[PDB]
Amino acid sequence: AISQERKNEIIKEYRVHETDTGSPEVQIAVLTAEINAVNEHLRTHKKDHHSRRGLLKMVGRRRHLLNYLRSKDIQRYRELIKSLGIRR
RNA sequence: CUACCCUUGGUCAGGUUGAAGUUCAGGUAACACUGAAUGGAGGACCGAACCGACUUACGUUGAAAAGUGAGCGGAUGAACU
RNA sequence: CGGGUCCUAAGCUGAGGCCGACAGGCGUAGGCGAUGGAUAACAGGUUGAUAUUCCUGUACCACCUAUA
RNA sequence: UAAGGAACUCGGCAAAAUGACCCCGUAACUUCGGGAGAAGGGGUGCUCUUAGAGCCGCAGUGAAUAGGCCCAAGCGACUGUUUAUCAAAAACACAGGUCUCUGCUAAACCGUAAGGUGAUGUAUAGGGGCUGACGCCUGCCCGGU
RNA sequence: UCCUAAGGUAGCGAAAUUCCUUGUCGGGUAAGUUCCGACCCGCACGAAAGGCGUAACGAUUUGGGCACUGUCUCAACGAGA
RNA sequence: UGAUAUUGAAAUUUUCUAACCCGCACCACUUAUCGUGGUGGGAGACAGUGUCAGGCGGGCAGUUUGA
RNA sequence: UGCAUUAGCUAGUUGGUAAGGUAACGGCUUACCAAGGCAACGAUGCAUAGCCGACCUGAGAGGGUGAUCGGCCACACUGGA
RNA sequence: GGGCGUAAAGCGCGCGUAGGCGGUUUUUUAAGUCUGAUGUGAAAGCCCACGGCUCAACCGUGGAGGGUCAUUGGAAACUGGAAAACUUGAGUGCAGAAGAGGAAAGUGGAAUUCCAUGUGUAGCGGUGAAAUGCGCAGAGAUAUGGAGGAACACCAGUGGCGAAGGCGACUUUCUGGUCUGUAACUGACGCUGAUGUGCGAAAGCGUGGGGAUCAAACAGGAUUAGAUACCCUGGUAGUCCACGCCGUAAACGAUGAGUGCUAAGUGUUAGGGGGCCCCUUAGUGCUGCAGCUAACGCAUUAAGCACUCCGCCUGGGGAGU
RNA sequence: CCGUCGAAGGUGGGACAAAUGAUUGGGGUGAAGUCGUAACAAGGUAGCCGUAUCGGAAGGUGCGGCUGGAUCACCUCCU
RNA sequence: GGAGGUGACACAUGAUAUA
RNA sequence: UACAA
Ligand SMILES: [K+]
Ligand SMILES: [K+]
Ligand SMILES: [K+]
Ligand SMILES: [Mg+2]
Ligand SMILES: [Mg+2]
Ligand SMILES: [Mg+2]
Ligand SMILES: [Mg+2]
Ligand SMILES: [Mg+2]
Ligand SMILES: [Mg+2]
Ligand SMILES: [Mg+2]
Ligand SMILES: [Mg+2]
Ligand SMILES: [Mg+2]
Ligand SMILES: [Mg+2]
Ligand SMILES: [Mg+2]
Ligand SMILES: [Mg+2]
Ligand SMILES: [Mg+2]
Ligand SMILES: [Mg+2]
Ligand SMILES: [Mg+2]
Ligand SMILES: [Mg+2]
Ligand SMILES: [Mg+2]
Ligand SMILES: [Mg+2]
Ligand SMILES: [Mg+2]
Ligand SMILES: [Mg+2]
Ligand SMILES: [Mg+2]
Ligand SMILES: [Mg+2]
Ligand SMILES: [Mg+2]
Ligand SMILES: [Mg+2]
Ligand SMILES: [Mg+2]
Ligand SMILES: [Mg+2]
Ligand SMILES: [Mg+2]
Ligand SMILES: [Mg+2]
Ligand SMILES: [Mg+2]
Ligand SMILES: [Mg+2]
Ligand SMILES: [Mg+2]
Ligand SMILES: [Mg+2]
Ligand SMILES: [Mg+2]
Ligand SMILES: [Mg+2]
Ligand SMILES: [Mg+2]
Ligand SMILES: [Mg+2]
Ligand SMILES: [Mg+2]
Ligand SMILES: [Mg+2]
Ligand SMILES: [Mg+2]
Ligand SMILES: [Mg+2]
Ligand SMILES: [Mg+2]
Ligand SMILES: [Mg+2]
Ligand SMILES: [Mg+2]
Ligand SMILES: [Mg+2]
Ligand SMILES: [Mg+2]
Ligand SMILES: [Mg+2]
Ligand SMILES: [Mg+2]
Ligand SMILES: [Mg+2]
Ligand SMILES: [Mg+2]
Ligand SMILES: [Mg+2]
Ligand SMILES: [Mg+2]
Ligand SMILES: [Mg+2]
Ligand SMILES: [Mg+2]
Ligand SMILES: [Mg+2]
Ligand SMILES: [Mg+2]
Ligand SMILES: [Mg+2]
Ligand SMILES: [Mg+2]
């Protein structure tokens, strides 16, 4: 869905420190771009159920990371919520 | 006159109902979906004008060679003129 | 003022033209044809009988002639 | 108009009853729109205070005008149309269905023809036959015509 | 068994079709040749001269009930032409 | 539907063009979706039309359908 | 205690203020204000049932019963004071 | 104090909410847990002891028992609450690799059917045997060309991919997942999953296209005592496409998911490390111990040994009514 | 004496529940009367599952699936 | 040798218990 | 064998 160049752009922007690729903020931001791209694919490929199943897993993984971030530090969580186009 | 049509005009008191859309709100990953408001559709509803003629009474050397009285059907439409 | 001296609709008619025993039928250009388009005046007074028409006051339109 | 209340009659024909506005409340069935004004019930006068307190009559939309309602069955889906002048209907039409003809100077129709309609349209179009919303469906026979 | 091209599927049925006939049974009535629901013995239903149903609609046809009444028992009085 | 006339030219049904036809395009008459001519294109001795013939023909007509 | 083949219930309802009322607190009652309160941890509705010490059974864990004796409640032909 | 491969019993399969459950360590707390104190758990009853009834029933007296009870003082291992660390679980990054995973649009070869043309003549077709059927108006056969729909030989393999249903010509575009290595990173972020929400062979349904082959129904021909069949000749829906619906199958491994542990041998698929072999991951098969099983059998892909969560069963018929 | 609240009663339309109703549907049991012979063997067309359709009936046929299918082949695997 | 994949005319019927 | 037909 997204290139390694676009992924590295997102990692650079949302990392909480240098050499960070595994924080919730980095993962949620990358998952958000991937979810948006597959939604773009599914708008002209409505019958692609198999791809849509993979999108549903990304949405579930993002929601779990968001729940963990919210319960650990709500300040980091609410700043990430506005940065992306995410409600809750 | 009447039937149908052509061209060009005109007319339809007031009430009632509340379609599609839209917006806001919930809701979603994105749609579906839902409520409120808005909106004003319909050979839609009730009912004058108007157009009819279902029932009944009267009239039947008529007021009238087809009518009158009382109700009755349609009444933004395939309307009436 | 309404109509004509303006415009076209349906329709009618139709120089030439096409068709048809005859008589005639159709039709092109064009023409006629309002129920539509265009278009300059109002208020008051007056008679037995007319009135945006007569009369009074105040206008507007088209055309003509002269100064411009 | 006593008492009765459809016993009248082919048939409740005619008449009586209902009726306005405001507020409650409303069934089977349903194509989810409806059915529905379903049904069934409450309130209306006048005066005073700012919803209460009073006043009067037999009666308060005090006159006139203003849906009767319910249950079930046949037919037709529906609005519409018809025998001017004894029939308005279950008849006609209808949206929908199907069959069939028609390649365009189309087929079909009027006309002797010319000229036209079809159509200033072109098979998602035009003419003709039958059926008649919608739902579920539409079996057998091609010997004869 | 005979014959045919083939001998009526689903659904419906005393029906706007049933002659016998007021068929028979049930419901409704005190009493119902009409009505409703069933049966099938369909004189002589039957699938686009469509079959079976169907919410909504009807001055349609048919049966029942409430309200209501001079329709009636059974007529009487009054107003006017 | 056939013959024949309009109706010709070559092969063996095919070909051709020149009669006939075009509710085919452009041009002129001409401010004209008529018409008439001109040029292209299509079609073509077919079609259309005349005469003759056979067939179908309640679409329409005249009649009959006894005592 | 059953039943989800019972999922929505409530509008004095839930809270507040004031007054009234009671032996007493209290929506207990009324007036005004606000829109709360309950529920899948089963609200609500329907059905069933007086509850307990005890009693019967069982190795026990459990299952079954509430006559007699004792505690508590409710009722006194039905309903309202 | 039971089960769910074949006896009744694993939802067809995902995603996921509530809930249940949850890796290592330190500090802290004290709800659960443990341990005393106090109060209370009436009397009668039951049980033990003793006394009175001639005995016994029975009666009486003294004890014991019965709470998930409350209040209060201690303990701190485990469960829970708070705080702080951790990297093994789970994710991310980086480096490789394989794949009929999915959606869309294009290109191609064989064959079937139909159509035309040329040659060419008497049958072709079909069965157990036949007949229906097609054919002298030229079939069938043969050669060439065209139209059209459908499906993709060989490759092809207890091979591969996918949650399952499923996925097989080739090309491009869009896109999902998995595996191996590394140890940058985050630091338990996990597992399961009622309700829910989605996907789901074939048949079937709606609208509209398409229509080669095959083929319910149906017709004819056979067979047969009959033949509403099996066989033959045809043939409609359907089979194909798009968009909706339906939500079911012996949807099967008749075996729910997760995690760990427990002999070996031997094929195969995709990788990695080291010297064709040895080691090692992850799949996919066969054989086979321990163990399990009623037996059959299963056996590191468990039906073994364990913990967590879900679904389901409780004799047969009636009745999945 | 007047008004608000007030049981019972009456009026109305619905909700629910139990009884019964011409006729009607399927089931169980009893007996084997009748018609066939569908399954069990390759049960004489392998059977079963879903679905569709047809038929006196068991059942047939189509499409997909399963082996919980007999007999004989050609291959992978194991011993 | 044993498995797993692959492929490959007609024949109706026979009551109840007790066996 | 006792039955059934
Ligand atoms: K007019
Ligand atoms: K037509
Ligand atoms: K014929
Ligand atoms: Mg007027
Ligand atoms: Mg109307
Ligand atoms: Mg009206
Ligand atoms: Mg009229
Ligand atoms: Mg009148
Ligand atoms: Mg009306
Ligand atoms: Mg003329
Ligand atoms: Mg005058
Ligand atoms: Mg009277
Ligand atoms: Mg009276
Ligand atoms: Mg009365
Ligand atoms: Mg009478
Ligand atoms: Mg009488
Ligand atoms: Mg009347
Ligand atoms: Mg009124
Ligand atoms: Mg009608
Ligand atoms: Mg009408
Ligand atoms: Mg008349
Ligand atoms: Mg009349
Ligand atoms: Mg008709
Ligand atoms: Mg014939
Ligand atoms: Mg008769
Ligand atoms: Mg008929
Ligand atoms: Mg027919
Ligand atoms: Mg017919
Ligand atoms: Mg009809
Ligand atoms: Mg009346
Ligand atoms: Mg008089
Ligand atoms: Mg005649
Ligand atoms: Mg004559
Ligand atoms: Mg005579
Ligand atoms: Mg009781
Ligand atoms: Mg026991
Ligand atoms: Mg057991
Ligand atoms: Mg299990
Ligand atoms: Mg079994
Ligand atoms: Mg089983
Ligand atoms: Mg399973
Ligand atoms: Mg299943
Ligand atoms: Mg004693
Ligand atoms: Mg990579
Ligand atoms: Mg991979
Ligand atoms: Mg899970
Ligand atoms: Mg579930
Ligand atoms: Mg299908
Ligand atoms: Mg066949
Ligand atoms: Mg289809
Ligand atoms: Mg589809
Ligand atoms: Mg199962
Ligand atoms: Mg397991
Ligand atoms: Mg395990
Ligand atoms: Mg083994
Ligand atoms: Mg292995
Ligand atoms: Mg058999
Ligand atoms: Mg068999
Ligand atoms: Mg069959
Ligand atoms: Mg399968």
Side-chain angles (χ1 to χ4, degrees), chain A residues 1-33 35-82:
Chain A
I2 71 158
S3 36
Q4 192 165 218
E5 304 68 80
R6 169 89 192 287
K7 195 218 275 162
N8 276 65
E9 292 158 23
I10 301 151
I11 298 169
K12 260 184 119 293
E13 157 164 359
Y14 284 93
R15 56 175 165 203
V16 301
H17 69 79
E18 266 264 334
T19 86
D20 168 68
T21 65
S23 76
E25 288 96 325
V26 162
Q27 290 189 57
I28 289 156
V30 175
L31 275 169
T32 300
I35 288 157
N36 295 341
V38 187
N39 263 315
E40 205 41 77
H41 162 80
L42 288 174
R43 277 177 272 231
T44 36
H45 295 280
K46 270 168 306 267
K47 252 62 193 110
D48 193 351
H49 305 301
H50 289 62
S51 294
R52 180 177 282 109
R53 188 211 182 226
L55 170 142
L56 259 302
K57 250 122 63 101
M58 302 173 199
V59 169
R61 195 158 308 286
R62 198 183 56 170
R63 165 89 261 130
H64 275 3
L65 285 163
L66 281 169
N67 287 356
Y68 172 77
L69 186 62
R70 188 178 75 211
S71 99
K72 211 183 55 143
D73 176 86
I74 211 156
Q75 310 108 290
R76 279 166 67 197
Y77 164 80
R78 58 176 163 46
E79 298 311 293
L80 176 73
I81 288 329
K82 344 197 171 93

